[PDB]
Write a protein that binds this ligand. Structure first.
Ligand SMILES: CC(=O)SCCNC(=O)CCNC(=O)[C@H](O)C(C)(C)COP(=O)(O)OP(=O)(O)OC[C@H]1O[C@@H](n2cnc3c(N)ncnc32)[C@H](O)[C@@H]1OP(=O)(O)O
Ligand SMILES: Cc1ncc(C[n+]2csc(CCOP(=O)(O)OP(=O)(O)O)c2C)c(N)n1
Ligand SMILES: Cc1ncc(C[n+]2csc(CCOP(=O)(O)OP(=O)(O)O)c2C)c(N)n1
Ligand SMILES: [Ca+2]
Ligand SMILES: [Ca+2]
Ligand SMILES: [Mg+2]
Ligand SMILES: [Mg+2]
Lengths: 814, 826
């Protein structure tokens, strides 16, 4: 019965020992810590060891300065791996390793002392009380270099950022302190091993003040780099040689939903990066808020249990345990290609900002902090107290600090066009690819007519929207471009129109027809690739990832598709903080494409609008391209121009739903082979037909699918006095092309902007103000024909929709 | 040997769920092969050991193993050893590891009756109407007797209400067979899949009843999750149950339904779970039911999540998780009742993962064998839950051939009743001013400290300055806010105020809660106003909390709270208005549009610190232009007050007008401490809210309105800078008019004020925000149309159009600020 009580004791330490570990350097919770003859008896564990030695191994491993959470991991081999490395008696670090960790603590503290002394308003960014994160990050990067990896990419909030730039990225003081925006900009550097012969690239990504919003952006950036190096999921090796190193705060990590959304991507085929190293700077405070008001779990890291990640809670006043846990984390990530979370328990020495006396809201915590000596002073005293360094060396370490402090002060003192048309053979090849099935492949009987109709369209014309899209993407791959397309149910298409990936009816094997265009007819690679995935049910993390992918590989054609444009508001922080504004704020460029299914069809307020008015409001000084094409060929030329123009700026496309199957919304072969993108479109009766522009007295200006309904109504009552002009590119406004087009209708007495969207929505709120100002001689007196202003994108009734739709058409021809 | 048994017991308790027969489709064939953790020989035990008695009590290994396999490896997969509380693990362990008595024929027939009613509802829906395939509950009808068991167990505990939140799948079935709404109400004259509902559940075999309600929601999956919590917490606060109540029953239960792909992918799930035990947000535990049909439209679970289960996020708060086979309605009803008992015993969330399937395509244009041929060849060989359960009861000898025929007659009768009832239906088809003594009382309250309380030395001058302000005037913004909230509590109103660092204030200005310098005890001065001077309660209360670092779940919760208690004054404060875009879905889908779409009314207040001060693009704008764009047909009130007294009257009008519509307030940062931005006692005691404000030199001074030839129209703090510049140059030819209420535009008040300046030759809208931001994009178009005789020729003075709310440089901000001021006086 005694040997059974030992087995239960071993399991208790492994499962719950972390609840008794001395992880808090402030020891705020006192309640945390609240036979002898058997201790010298040998037990079978098959090895023979004395109970006192088994128990000492269990206390050192699980109840010392490291709290290990791993028995929640479903993989027995991963539990076994941790168990073996944590439960073995490790050899104490060498005097050289201790002196090295100490120099890193000196550099970090001197940097902090310099920041608060030289400049004013720097208290918010203070890393004082959390300096151990610097030798911890150093150990992460050094262990990644020891595995021979290519790059470590960092994402972090603002606390200690300039310290990371100087002591991790290795940026010189002259570059750091030159003129805050500096706390949001990206950076690149080279890490050179101190005791090794390896080097590794280290980069820091740009981010807003919005905590954790950069998390899926880092993942996308890293995946794009991993794809370029041919490493990982889409590569020839399983090394995933680009490592994401993600920094967090404790209140942010537990409260922001994007954390869970980004963790949810960790093992997905379209989003995995081979595991992220997470470091939580757990100072047990969020501004003035205590952890008991910030989370409903024991640890701020408990969300990471969602993906069975091992969690290490470590005492920030023990830099050796912190460096050891950082190296173990890199080894686990390398061995299992899964996320590791390091929870660094520390404190925030100063107030949150200049106007904060933290004892006002946390008197107890700050009476304990005011008793604490720095983790530098503590570690140097601890090295003297254990006899690991001499009195001369301890003075030298103290003199290393002074020289590090003097150096910053003295260095900062010293400082003080292309064609998008393809040939008919290119169209024919993309059409033929849909029927070039692998041997023994069984196409689903309802998919086979789609493949046959695409080979017919490629040779005979009447090209629909869905095929035009694949013609654009396919021709880019054939030219050597990497095309990454993703979104909810994007492989088949929400409207069963895409079939980018087709599934074997008998085996379930996937076949990608456009991937055949990555190989030239002679069998040589084009250098191009088609990467198409079904995303998780996320908007915030998925849009963030695709923006990040566009930044990681500026040469890639990156498209994200919303199920319906109505759901993109779930990614509003990414749209506001990165996509629309990254270039102006940080000089960070993104070529990301957002495909937003849009249009009034009676399917309700959440299946009608991509909120065109919101994107037009965000636009300024050529920041993005915003388009609503009405024709398959014009969409094809829009995608090819974006993929070939070399302008790294986002593209927002309001794509159709029912217009995908509108038989009037088809294009001729010549529209792809002898044309280009047209920002302004006239009716074909005036450009190709026998229509007379001089009979026109009423001009209707519009965009999107409503054109076909207006055109049908004009044809039904032969209204030669009315002309319909489409604005395909909403932003930047094609001022030049718009003026030249309207000049061709000299007898126009009235002009109307016609739209399906309510008066406070669509293009009218911006066009109604801009068009009379930009073109006063053409648009003074411009009137609106639309739905009435609504507090929702549309009515919930399809009957109300139909009445309103007819009301617009009747007003336009009244 | 005894050690190998202890390891075997732990293995079943920890990992037995990985071998449980939970999938009714049995898609993964490798699931039952290769499981050494649970294997006897893989632990160092033989067939000889099976008849040996072990200490666990003394029981044979064979009995230990039969108890473990029945409890953890049959149709229920139990995850609970991740729970840090040993008493919670032991509670589950005892109830799961005991041999339960088989359900009575009466209970079995009742479960079969609920499946009969659910399948008959689903059969009518697909047969009578077209375009109903997307709402089909076919393959998941066991969720109806499962929900019935939840509600019946809540009634058995004597609870007051169950509030349901769910996506659209099986919604009308829930309305008919759970909420109990009649078919005449359900199928009269879709929006019906988004509307709220209330009903009464009456126990079948009991004498208790319980209220059952369904909340309104958009098509945005999981967005309603925090809204349900807020709504339920508001109801708990009214019933004096829960966290802010004398009874610890939490007698209003949230029943939250989910889909498997959405539960794993939506971040709002984790944000809402994170609220579960917070003093300001806890609802005594939510019962979660995931309708896990192992598909999300055309997407397989392996592309939807990075974990074994769609429910693994719930481990974040140490919630017990039950994976149950949807083809076993008895195990499903049993797990539902156990979930209610756990929630009652520990006031924590329970998650039920119901494994089932989706019989049809996702919608009308879906042949799901196109994308999932294997799954759908397996679904095609499966007969429904009702039929399979009828056949099981037959084999077990629990019912006879006559009884099964009678159950099929019950199904036919339920199916005829829908068709018939719908056939018949088709055939017939205020003053806001307070007395000075009220102000003095709120001022005195700041110094009426509890005996032995130690005020922080930096907080004491704030308390003393508030008593001086209350008696002498020069009332600042921060105190005016508390004067408004305090006077409402004194009148009997419930005031709920929350947000990031809201107790102290982001700008160290509020001090709604003060903390004892020696003990950490909290003291709320405004809570003293809930008691009249005679000692009787006013009926009012002050509920003030620091929120978690969430925008989406926190704004969702506060919107839900205003719906749950329409009589409450509910305010949510952003740290900076720049971070409210994290809650855009709640703003777009509930706040701005809930009234027009569902008839659901909300009185929620959003306080959004706003203003250009050189702190960068994320500490400058609450995006006024976005709220003005969302506004239509008086859906919300949008204001930017420039004065403490005008803010006070704005909050009191909102709290007393009886108009259940949201209020959006763009609040100050540096203007909190602007010494010109103070109000007199008479502004609170003898005035009201002013939507349009003139300069005091014209209304109270010796200023001449007839000398004015240039009129500057503006809003917010820039008024003080424009006023200082006018005073500096003695510019009598320029007048500054403020628009305090941006939406609905005060058309009449604006027209009457401008008519008082007859010699105006030019008008300008002046703003700090870029030309594509602030009020200009809407005012520039609206003002010349609504008031053509006053605003034709209206010009803009602002910052240039920008792709961000401001520049990152405070030097660039300062130059642009001066440029605006010089253009206005050029
Ligand atoms: C709509 C036209 O409003 P106007 O007459 O131009 O402006 P004004 O601000 O004076 O509003 C008039 C009245 O309606 C009330 N009111 C105006 N807007 C609102 C609102 N958004 N919410 C509640 N009450 C309002 C005012 O408080 C005022 O009440 P009063 O009778 O004490 O003067
Ligand atoms: C999405 C978002 N919400 C709110 C804020 C405002 N904010 C800035 S710092 C802070 C508290 C941060 O707490 P924590 O994550 O523990 O980091 P710490 O400052 O302690 O390192 C908040 C709420 C923000 N920057 N982002
Ligand atoms: C936030 C959001 N994003 C996307 C959609 C579009 N959408 C509707 S149903 C669906 C798949 C749902 O999967 P699941 O949660 O498993 O539910 P099920 O339809 O299987 O019951 C999606 C992505 C949505 N309604 N909401
Ligand atoms: Ca481009
Ligand atoms: Ca109101
Ligand atoms: Mg913190
Ligand atoms: Mg599903």
């Amino acid at each position: 019965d005694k040997n059974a009580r030992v087995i239960e004791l071993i399991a208790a330490y492994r499962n719950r020992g972390h609840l008794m570990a001395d992880i808090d350097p402030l020891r705020l919770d006192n309640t945390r810590f609240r036979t002898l003859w058997d201790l010298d008896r040998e037990f079978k564990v098959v090895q023979r060891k004395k109970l006192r030695d088994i128990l000492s191994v269990l206390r050192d491993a699980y109840c010392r300065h490291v709290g290990v959470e791993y028995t929640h991991i479903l993989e027995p081999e991963q539990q076994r791996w941790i168990q073996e490395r944590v439960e073995t008696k490790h050899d104490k670090p060498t005097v050289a390793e201790q002196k090295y960790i100490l120099s890193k603590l000196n550099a970090a503290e001197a940097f902090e002392t310099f920041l608060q002394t030289k400049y004013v308003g720097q208290k918010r960014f203070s890393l004082e009380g959390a300096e151990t994160v610097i030798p911890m990050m150093d150990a992460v990067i050094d262990q990644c270099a020891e595995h021979g990896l290519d790059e470590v990419v960092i994402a972090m909030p603002h606390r200690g950022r300039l310290n990371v730039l100087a002591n991790i990225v290795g940026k010189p003081y002259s570059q750091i302190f030159s003129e805050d925006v500096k706390y949001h900009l990206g950076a690149t550097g080279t890490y050179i091993q101190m005791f090794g012969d390896n080097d590794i690239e280290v980069s820091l990504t740009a981010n807003p003040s919005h905590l954790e919003a950069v998390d899926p952006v880092l993942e996308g950036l890293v995946r794009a780099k991993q794809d370029l190096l041919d490493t990982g999921e889409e590569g020839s090796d399983n090394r995933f040689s680009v490592v994401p190193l993600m920094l967090h705060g404790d209140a942010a990590f537990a409260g922001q939903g994007v954390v869970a959304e980004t963790l949810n991507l960790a093992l997905l085929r379209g989003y995995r990066t081979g595991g992220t190293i997470h470091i939580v700077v757990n100072n047990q405070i969020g501004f003035t808020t205590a952890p008991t008001d910030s989370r409903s779990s024991e640890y701020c890291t408990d969300v990471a249990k969602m993906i069975g990640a091992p969690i290490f809670h470590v005492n920030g006043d023990d830099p050796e345990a912190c460096a050891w846990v950082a190296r173990l984390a890199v080894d686990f990530r390398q061995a299992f290609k899964k996320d590791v979370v390091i929870d660094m328990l520390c404190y925030r020495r100063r107030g949150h900002n200049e106007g904060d006396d933290p004892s006002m809201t946390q008197p107890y915590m700050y009476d304990v902090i005011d008793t604490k000596r720095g983790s530098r002073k503590a570690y140097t005293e601890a090295l003297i107290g254990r006899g690991d360094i001499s009195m001369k060396e301890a003075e030298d370490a103290l003199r290393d600090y002074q020289g590090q402090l003097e150096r910053v002060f003295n260095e900062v003192r010293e400082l003080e066009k292309l064609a998008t048309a393809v040939d008919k053979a290119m169209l024919q090849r993309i059409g033929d690819a849909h029927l070039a099935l692998p041997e023994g492949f069984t196409v689903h009987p309802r998919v086979r007519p789609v493949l046959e109709k695409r080979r017919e369209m490629a040779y005979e014309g009447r090209i629909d929207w869905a095929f035009a899209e694949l013609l654009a993407l396919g021709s880019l791959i054939a030219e050597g471009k990497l095309v990454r397309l993703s979104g909810q149910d994007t492989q088949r298409g929400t409207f069963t129109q895409r079939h980018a990936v087709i599934v074997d009816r008998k085996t379930g094997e996937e076949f990608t027809p456009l991937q055949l265009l990555a190989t030239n007819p002679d069998g040589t690679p084009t250098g191009g690739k088609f990467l198409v995935y079904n995303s998780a049910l996320s908007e915030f993390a998925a849009v963030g990832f695709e923006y990040g992918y566009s930044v990681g590989n500026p040469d890639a054609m990156v498209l994200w598709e919303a199920q319906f444009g109505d759901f993109v508001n779930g990614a509003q922080s990414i749209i506001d903080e990165f996509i629309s504004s990254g270039e102006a704020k940080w000089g960070q460029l993104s070529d990301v494409v957002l495909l937003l299914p849009h249009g009034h069809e009676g399917q309700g307020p959440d299946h009608t609008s991509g909120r065109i008015e919101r994107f037009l409001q965000l636009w300024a000084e050529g920041s993005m391209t915003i388009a609503m094409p009405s024709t398959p060929a014009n969409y094809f030329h829009l995608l090819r121009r974006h993929g070939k123009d070399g302008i790294q700026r986002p593209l927002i496309v309001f794509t159709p739903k029912s217009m995908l199957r509108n038989k009037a919304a088809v294009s001729d072969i010549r529209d792809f082979t002898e044309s280009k993108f047209r920002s302004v479109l006239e009716e074909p009766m005036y450009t190709d037909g026998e229509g007379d522009r001089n009979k026109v007295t009423r001009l209707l200006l519009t965009s999107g699918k409503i054109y076909y309904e207006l055109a049908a109504r004009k044809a039904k009552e032969n209204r030669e006095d009315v002309a319909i002009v489409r604005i395909e590119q909403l932003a930047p406004l094609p001022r030049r092309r718009l003026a030249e087009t309207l000049d061709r209708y000299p007898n126009v007495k009235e002009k109307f902007w016609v739209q399906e969207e309510p008066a406070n929505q669509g293009a009218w709120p911006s066009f109604g103000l801009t068009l009379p100002e930009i073109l006063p001689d053409h648009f003074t007196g411009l009137k609106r024909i639309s739905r009435r202003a609504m507090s929702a994108p549309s009515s919930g009734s399809s009957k109300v929709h139909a009445v309103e739709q007819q009301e617009i058409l009747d007003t336009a021809f009244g």
